[PDB]
């Protein structure tokens, strides 16, 4: 399963 939201990678 993949979370619909997370901190954008940067």
């Amino acid at each position: 399963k993949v979370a619909v939201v997370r901190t954008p990678p940067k």
Partner: antibody, heavy 127, light 105 residues
Framework: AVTLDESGGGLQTPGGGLSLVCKAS????????MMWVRQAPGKGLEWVAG????????GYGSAVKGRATISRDNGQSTVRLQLNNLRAEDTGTYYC????????????????????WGHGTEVIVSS | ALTQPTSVSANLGGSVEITCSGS???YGWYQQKAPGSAPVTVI????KRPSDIPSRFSGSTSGSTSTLTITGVQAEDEAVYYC???????????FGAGTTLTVLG
């Protein structure tokens, strides 16, 4: 083993502000995205706010948008909900809620992924 | 918004089904025996049952509709069941209005 313990409720000032704290125990808080849910007297559950594992992204329900601030302190194992410009419509029980899966799998607004609920804290908005 | 029926009735020892629609994402089912009391998750992520929940509780999402099934209803199952899911259009969490289960007899 998992416990979510809310505090900061009680009688609150209309137009004023409140600060709710969820103290999490029995799991590593930093491995999870977290959310707050509320229930007004004689009403159903309503999604309030959510936060990613390191506080990088926040989200709010339409009823509190622009008046709410969700934050977390992984080091202290706490999630905090601030709400201002309090109104009668904010009266209810506020619950801290934990997703069943880790931050990679369940996001903060995935209200279908909840496995643990706090005991809840009562908020009364009245002068 | 999520759509679930206001009420449902089941006979003791029988079966009951509760549907929930309105999300294209994963559904959860939360039991509440009294308002203001902490809900109890019976089903999360469509069909997963938490360790402390009896086998009689099952979940099934087919298409974009979830069905909560209780096979072999007991008197303690009488509660309000709320469905929860992600709102793909608006971006936050959403809940259904709740389904009241009455155990007949």
């Amino acid at each position: 083993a998992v416990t979510l313990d809310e505090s900061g409720g009680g009688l609150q000032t209309p137009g004023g502000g409140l600060s709710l704290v969820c103290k999490a125990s029995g799991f590593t808080l930093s491995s999870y995205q977290m959310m707050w849910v509320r229930q007004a007297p004689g009403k159903g559950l309503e999604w309030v706010a959510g936060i990613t594992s390191r506080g990088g992204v926040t989200g709010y329900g339409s009823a509190v948008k622009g008046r709410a601030t969700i934050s977390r302190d992984n080091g202290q194992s706490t999630v905090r909900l601030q709400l201002n410009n309090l109104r009668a419509e904010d009266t209810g029980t506020y619950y801290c809620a934990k997703p069943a899966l880790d931050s990679d799998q369940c996001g903060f607004p995935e209200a279908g992924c909840i496995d643990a609920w706090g005991h809840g804290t009562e908020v009364i908005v009245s002068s | 918004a999520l759509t679930q029926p206001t009420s449902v009735s089941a006979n003791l020892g029988g079966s009951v089904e509760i549907t929930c629609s309105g999300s294209d994402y994963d559904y959860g089912w939360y039991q509440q025996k009294a308002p203001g009391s902490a809900p109890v998750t019976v089903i999360y992520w469509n069909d997963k049952r938490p360790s402390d929940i009896p086998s009689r509780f099952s979940g099934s999402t087919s298409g974009s509709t979830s069905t909560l099934t209780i096979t072999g209803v007991q008197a303690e199952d009488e509660a309000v069941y709320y469905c929860g899911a992600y709102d793909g259009s608006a971006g936050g969490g959403i809940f259904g209005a709740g389904t009241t289960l009455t155990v007949l007899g």
